[PDB]
Design an enzyme around this catalytic site. Structure first.
Site, mmCIF file in Angstrom:
data_model
loop_
_atom_site.group_PDB
_atom_site.id
_atom_site.type_symbol
_atom_site.label_atom_id
_atom_site.label_comp_id
_atom_site.label_asym_id
_atom_site.label_seq_id
_atom_site.Cartn_x
_atom_site.Cartn_y
_atom_site.Cartn_z
ATOM 1 N NE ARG A 1 -3.560 -2.454 2.410
ATOM 2 C CZ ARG A 1 -3.332 -3.249 3.443
ATOM 3 N NH1 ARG A 1 -2.509 -2.857 4.399
ATOM 4 N NH2 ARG A 1 -3.924 -4.426 3.524
HETATM 5 N N1 LIG Z 1 -7.660 6.502 -7.820
HETATM 6 C C1 LIG Z 1 -6.430 5.970 -7.645
HETATM 7 N N2 LIG Z 1 -5.398 6.322 -8.438
HETATM 8 C C2 LIG Z 1 -4.171 5.798 -8.272
HETATM 9 N N3 LIG Z 1 -3.868 4.894 -7.326
HETATM 10 C C3 LIG Z 1 -4.807 4.450 -6.463
HETATM 11 C C4 LIG Z 1 -6.171 4.979 -6.580
HETATM 12 N N4 LIG Z 1 -6.898 4.385 -5.621
HETATM 13 C C5 LIG Z 1 -6.069 3.551 -4.946
HETATM 14 N N5 LIG Z 1 -4.824 3.591 -5.446
HETATM 15 C C6 LIG Z 1 -3.673 2.805 -4.945
HETATM 16 O O1 LIG Z 1 -4.081 2.066 -3.798
HETATM 17 C C7 LIG Z 1 -3.163 2.244 -2.722
HETATM 18 C C8 LIG Z 1 -3.924 2.359 -1.411
HETATM 19 O O2 LIG Z 1 -4.886 1.315 -1.357
HETATM 20 P P1 LIG Z 1 -5.980 1.301 -0.190
HETATM 21 O O3 LIG Z 1 -6.951 2.419 -0.455
HETATM 22 O O4 LIG Z 1 -5.253 1.226 1.122
HETATM 23 O O5 LIG Z 1 -6.732 -0.093 -0.444
HETATM 24 P P2 LIG Z 1 -7.361 -0.908 0.782
HETATM 25 O O6 LIG Z 1 -7.912 0.169 1.679
HETATM 26 O O7 LIG Z 1 -8.404 -1.779 0.139
HETATM 27 O O8 LIG Z 1 -6.193 -1.664 1.357
HETATM 28 C C9 LIG Z 1 -2.377 3.503 -3.017
HETATM 29 O O9 LIG Z 1 -0.989 3.303 -2.747
HETATM 30 C C10 LIG Z 1 -2.586 3.762 -4.490
HETATM 31 O O10 LIG Z 1 -1.374 3.479 -5.192
#
Ligand SMILES: Nc1ncnc2c1ncn2[C@@H]1O[C@H](COP(=O)(O)OP(=O)(O)O)[C@@H](O)[C@H]1O
Ligand SMILES: Nc1ncnc2c1ncn2[C@@H]1O[C@H](COP(=O)(O)OP(=O)(O)OP(=O)(O)O)[C@@H](O)[C@H]1O
Ligand SMILES: Nc1ncnc2c1ncn2[C@@H]1O[C@H](COP(=O)(O)OP(=O)(O)OP(=O)(O)O)[C@@H](O)[C@H]1O
Ligand SMILES: [Mg+2]
Ligand SMILES: [Mg+2]
Ligand SMILES: [Mg+2]
Lengths: 471, 478, 471
Positions: free
Chosen positions: B342
């Site tokens: 992440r």
């Molecule tokens: N709209 C977006 N554009 C680019 N990258 C994104 C986007 N949404 C999520 N990411 C990627 O997802 C990562 C974070 O994920 P996260 O929101 O923590 O997922 P989860 O909460 O399901 O673990 C970021 O490092 C980013 O690189």
């Protein structure tokens, strides 16, 4: 008064009450010696090992023999020391039970001979040896893919009836006759028929003059099956320490140790663990395995057969044992039923000596290439089964064609297997094995029939078989 | 002189029940008459459950027990660097006494939410696959999970070795390993010289269960001592699965109610408390960082077991190692599809950021097409090109043991692959191409390497194209 | 006057004994405050929640912090009420723990401020209001295929790293921009790094001072991890019931709420239910989810992110949260890898607001056609995988051509995506969405390349990018 009384008898477990302030420490030995007072009793000569303190001046013990005939209120005698095993030059050529008494009907042992306790702390970090060097055995699969390490721990996993004991006998036949040092065999929970056969075989070969045998067995109670391994291990430790000789330590079915522990654990008042095993499975196994090592004073290399219950390799007992070995071999019933012996799994088996610095660049490359082709053949099997060999590309055709011949060539004819077949065994040097596998991977023998490769030694024997049959 | 004193009721399996000790605190360190130590984990109405930290064969019913009124501490300092120590802090390599002064409580609060700063700087492992697809930053927690013999220890060893230049301290914690294996690891580190900035904490299999239970906390305390001084620490835990097994043993022997798979109800509490102490301190607090690399071993790929799920939910990302990839020649065996990170993107230099985005899509297309190879071949020019690109990508992301690669060379080879300069090289020769390209870059393209190393950015694409073309003009193909 | 007395300490579980007839009620809060008497003691400031009545004037309690340092016989003060937290305009702009103590280091809450109990019964059947009105959010996929309902519950599902947290952040920003209401964020099982990033993002964006944040960080005990959600819920319920506003709840992760519940139950000693969960999973989930409803004085809508272990939707936590939701949204690793954010699965995502009489006939027709074309494209892909697209019929090739455009148009660029890419975000109205999707489907943009549609916003920006590329 340093005497006790029997309170409870529940199978292989006996509770004893002592006078206040005179309890025996854990792992000490107790002796019950009784002569029948009247005709409604039987004579008893049995030994116990202290395991727990229950409070209220009560001690819970484990029996080393059958507990038939025990009556509440029997007198228990305390010896003040753990089980002491006779050790030294005396034990060479002899056969013992768990208690260190000779059962070979060749006379007793003098009562003033040196003897050591079974229980001792493990060696420390600063004393262990770390040099890795190869031990050759004459078995093609072992020498090629999972080389055995001198001075290290080697395990032979397997199921029921797969070839695990025959492999140990072959290793004895190939190594034990030229060791120079001492070999110690400790049979844990195995067949008395196997024990007798091995004793007679070693006696006939004459190597009996430099070996000691301890024989707890399937027939004995869990206490004996739980302490026979340690009884053998103390002799091995003495030979390592006080003389510095190289020692071979053959242990058969070390799984029976944990099985007996699991048998007793329920009656000791412990809560069960994940699969019904004892909660103390890992630490108990560690306190045994960590004593089987090599130090600066002397070297010990050990070979342990490990039974796998219900062929589940994920069972806790096999799963915990994997971290205690340097080189392991997995035998598979799937390979066994195909007529391919020694049925060694070529992918699951690993060894710490398979490195380009130890075995050599050519050997390392050839072994890795063989593993790669076998993995690809494993991968293709599902589509082969579903929609036939027809749809394989020309690359996969060659992959399968080479892989089947390689897998068959991994089989071998053993010297001990001659009692089952007419074929005398073979001993194959590592250089010849490397040459043969490189040649097969090179495409020389693409025309021979597949069955020509079964149960032979050097690659020349394959061509001789392909000349004896057909062309 | 007198102290608060109890009396033993029961002894067995490394557990001692004591009667008395009215004023003992929960978790307080307690010593027996034999001279061995204990720890009070159960505070019952009429008795106290004590876990024994040493050989318990000397403890008998009726022996008196003494309070100490202290919580367990571990020695910390610069002196430990280069040594192998017990979880209690005593040396085991035999090199003599360890002369430290300060001590830290084994249980201490983690840095607060206000004290932290966002992770923004990289941790160079030297593994191309990890540094390209699953980046790791300072202050991050990355889980490495796989079956046995997949390379988990080797990844950690490479990462520890690669930190020779960066002013970062390494800590290796061995839990449940065999002492011979630990000694082999120590000698392997010594060969390459990692012992000059490493501390090894060992808790073998032959030691009592509480030491295996406590070792990670000793490691993280020694790490936090350096972290709060402004340094950077890399902590590696070798088997949280083995730690959890030891804690389950203790919980069952103390007769606490069991959960699923006989695990105690607070195993997640234990692991969360351990792992939430890695952080990236703000510049108010000094700017230090501590990153953790826990290991979890799975049985035949079951990632859905209790401990694997607990650890997976806690960490910032996971790296998956698989035997199917390992034996097919693909080593290191990172499954780039399942693995996540992440923090990634803020832990990667701009040059690597520019190329990793295209690398991900190139891998994903090949991974999607591979599932249908059994039915349709030569489907179209698009699939042919995708397969060739993916095969060359897989060949690029492959490297041998104990050979780390600097970030500038990594980004240069990845750029060369992703721009199409390898599309005219047979797939069998890409490894030798990489080796000869590295030699050529060392010999002649020093200006480009220095530019990358200085400005964290790619050189101008005219000069880089010139250099790649010049190398290709002399590369010989076999 | 009465004070308790600590009897047992068994980890995060504590037993307290009171005088007969003066026991605390279930869920009451107990305080332990102990300045150390001497050097062999440690200061304690701790709180507990009552769980069971054990009889004999004994109370079983669960701790809300670390229990280290406790001594059998300490004094416990009963507060005579459940956990109470400050509410009102004070809470805005602040960050609290489970107990309502601020952790933002901005100061302490005045002691005269009003506090409300954590535990209260759900609103009755008499006082509910059941009108449907759409919650515009400015995201193409949400506003097209899975519209949100003001006053309803929305669930986000997916594996690790897919984008749930970033999607919640984007919803916070967009809604606090285009509606200017009051929102509450509850970080159940919060990661400290993610919490710090979220707080500094709030400071940067200026959305704070219009929201309250509660954090249960992972290293806290399960009692606190379980009560954080109810703390957030009561803080939102104040704004609904008292001031007559409309409130948004943002819950970090419900899977961690259920995990904490199961851990608490296992500690208390109850028998595990299916796959080891607590027996009262359904009742705890219902007690949380029933209080989030709309009444006459105001409405509370809640957006909940759900973690799915190993892509298994039959796990009890997701399977029991599926019952309460009004809309769902499945996020996919596969769509995330292709560069398509927010990686929403357009086919799995369903809502009950997608009805012709609620959103409109044209909107319903457009969404239905989009779904049909996407599903048709999915089916044809596997036919193509074995038989070349040159074999396909002309109309299905047209379907593929348009489905590429539709799939790549469903993607968007976000405000909070600047920190990842540098490209500034966008907000798209629902009419713009439906009209843009009526085109493309009509055929107005067949000549444009597919790469111009990715992460675009309004339809005109597709033409702008195409012009920038010369096409
Ligand atoms: N709209 C977006 N554009 C680019 N990258 C994104 C986007 N949404 C999520 N990411 C990627 O997802 C990562 C974070 O994920 P996260 O929101 O923590 O997922 P989860 O909460 O399901 O673990 C970021 O490092 C980013 O690189
Ligand atoms: N190399 C071999 N050549 C021929 N037959 C073999 C070979 N290895 C095993 N077998 C066959 O398989 C049998 C297995 O014998 P063995 O006692 O070694 O098995 P095991 O794994 O120890 O089984 P158990 O659990 O019954 O003790 C042999 O008796 C023989 O029939
Ligand atoms: N990249 C690599 N190239 C070649 N060999 C490798 C590589 N990575 C690991 N190996 C080898 O694979 C074997 C097993 O790897 P390793 O011991 O590091 O894995 P592990 O999962 O930590 O194992 P264990 O469960 O035995 O502790 C070793 O012989 C090691 O040398
Ligand atoms: Mg056998
Ligand atoms: Mg390893
Ligand atoms: Mg998240």
């Amino acid at each position: 008064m340093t005497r006790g009384r029997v309170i409870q008898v529940m199978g292989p477990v006996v509770d004893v009450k002592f006078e206040n302030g005179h309890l025996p420490a854990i792992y000490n030995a107790l002796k019950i010696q009784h002569k029948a007072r009247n005709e409604n009793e039987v004579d008893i000569d049995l030994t116990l090992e202290v395991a727990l303190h229950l409070g209220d001046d009560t001690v819970r013990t484990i029996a080393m023999a059958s507990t038939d005939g025990l009556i509440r209120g029997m007198e228990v005698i305390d010896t003040g020391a753990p089980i002491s095993v006779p050790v030294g030059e005396v034990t060479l050529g002899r056969v013992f039970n768990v208690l260190g008494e000779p059962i070979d009907l060749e006379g007793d042992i003098p009562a003033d001979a040196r003897r050591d306790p079974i229980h001792r702390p493990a060696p420390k970090f600063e004393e262990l040896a770390t040099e890795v060097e190869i031990l050759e055995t004459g078995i093609k699969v072992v020498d090629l893919l999972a080389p055995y390490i001198k001075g290290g721990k080697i395990g032979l996993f397997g199921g029921a009836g797969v070839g695990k004991t025959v492999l140990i006998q072959e290793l004895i036949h190939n190594i034990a006759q030229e060791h120079g040092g001492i070999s110690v065999f400790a049979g844990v929970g195995e067949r008395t028929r196997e024990g007798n056969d091995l004793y007679h075989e070693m006696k006939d070969s004459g190597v009996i003059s430099k070996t000691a045998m301890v024989f707890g067995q399937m027939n004995e109670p869990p206490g004996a099956r739980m302490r026979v391994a340690l009884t053998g291990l103390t002799m091995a430790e003495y030979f390592r320490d006080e003389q510095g000789q190289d020692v071979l330590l053959f242990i058969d079915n070390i799984f029976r140790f944990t099985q007996a522990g699991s048998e007793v654990s329920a009656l000791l008042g412990r809560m069960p663990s994940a699969v019904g095993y004892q909660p103390t499975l890992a630490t108990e196994m560690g306190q045994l395995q960590e004593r089987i090592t090599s130090t600066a004073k002397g070297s010990i290399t050990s070979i342990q057969a490990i039974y796998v219950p219900a062929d589940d390799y994920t069972d806790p007992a096999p799963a915990t044992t994997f971290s205690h070995l340097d080189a392991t071999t997995n035998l598979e019933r799937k390979l066994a039923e195909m007529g391919i012996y020694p049925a060694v799994d070529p992918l699951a088996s690993t060894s710490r000596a398979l490195a380009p610095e130890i075995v050599g660049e050519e050997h390392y490359q050839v072994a890795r290439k063989v593993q790669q082709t076998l993995q690809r053949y494993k991968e293709l099997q599902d589509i082969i089964a579903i929609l036939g060999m027809d749809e394989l590309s020309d690359e996969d055709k060659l992959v399968v064609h080479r892989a089947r011949r390689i897998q068959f060539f991994l089989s071998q004819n053993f010297h001990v297997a001659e009692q089952f077949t007419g074929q005398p065994g073979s001993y194959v040097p590592v250089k010849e094995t490397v040459r043969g596998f490189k040649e097969i991977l090179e495409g020389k023998y693409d025309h021979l029939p597949e069955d020509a490769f079964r149960l032979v030694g050097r690659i020349e024997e394959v061509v001789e078989k392909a000349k004896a049959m057909g062309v | 002189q007198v102290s608060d004193v109890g009396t033993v009721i029961q002894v067995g399996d490394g557990i001692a029940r004591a009667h008395g000790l009215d004023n003992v605190m929960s978790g307080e360190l307690v010593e027996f008459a034999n001279g061995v130590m204990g720890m009070a984990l159960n505070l019952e109405e009429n008795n106290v459950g004590i876990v024994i930290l040493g050989p318990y064969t000397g403890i008998k019913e009726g022996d008196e027990v003494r309070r100490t009124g202290r919580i367990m501490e571990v020695p910390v300092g610069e002196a430990l660097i280069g040594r192998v120590v017990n979880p209690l802090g005593q040396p085991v390599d035999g090199l003599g006494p360890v002369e430290t002064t300060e001590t830290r409580p084994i249980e201490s609060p983690a840095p607060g939410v206000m004290d932290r700063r966002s992770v923004h700087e990289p941790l160079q492992t030297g593994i191309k696959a990890i540094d390209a697809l699953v980046p790791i930053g300072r202050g991050q927690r990355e889980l490495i999970i796989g079956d046995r013999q997949t390379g988990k220890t080797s990844v950690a060893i490479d990462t520890i070795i690669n930190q020779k230049d960066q002013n970062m301290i390494s800590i290796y914690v061995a839990i449940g390993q065999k002492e011979s294996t630990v000694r082999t690891v120590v000698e392997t580190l010594r060969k390459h010289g990692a012992l000059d900035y490493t501390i090894v904490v060992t808790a073998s299999a032959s030691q009592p269960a509480p030491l295996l239970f406590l070792a990670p906390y000793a490691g993280v305390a020694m790490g936090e001592y350096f972290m709060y001084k402004g340094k950077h620490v890399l902590v590696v835990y070798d088997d949280l699965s083995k730690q959890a097994a030891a804690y389950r043993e203790l919980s069952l022997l103390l007769r606490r109610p069991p959960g699923r798979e006989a695990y105690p109800g607070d195993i997640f509490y234990l692991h969360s408390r351990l792992l939430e102490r890695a952080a990236k301190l703000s510049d108010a607090k000094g700017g230090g960082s501590l990153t953790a690399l826990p290991f979890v071993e799975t049985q035949a790929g079951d990632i859905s077991a209790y401990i694997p799920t607990n650890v997976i939910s806690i960490t910032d990302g996971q790296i998956f190692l698989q035997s199917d990839l390992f034996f097919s020649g693909v080593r290191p065996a990172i499954n780039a599809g399942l693995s996540v990170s992440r923090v990634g993107g803020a832990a990667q230099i701009k040059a690597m950021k520019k190329v990793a985005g295209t690398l991900r899509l190139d891998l994903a297309a090949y991974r999607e097409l591979e599932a249908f190879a059994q039915f349709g071949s030569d489907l179209d020019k698009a699939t042919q090109a995708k397969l060739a690109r993916g095969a060359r990508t897989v060949e690029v992301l492959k490297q041998d043991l104990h050979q780390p690669i600097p970030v500038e060379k990594q980004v240069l080879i990845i750029y060369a692959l992703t721009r199409g300069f390898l599309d005219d090289i047979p797939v069998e020769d890409v490894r030798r191409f990489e080796k000869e390209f590295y030699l050529f870059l060392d010999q002649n393209g020093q200006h480009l390497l220095e530019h990358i190393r200085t400005t964290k950015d790619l050189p101008n694409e005219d000069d880089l194209n010139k250099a790649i073309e010049a190398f290709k003009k002399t590369f010989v193909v076999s």
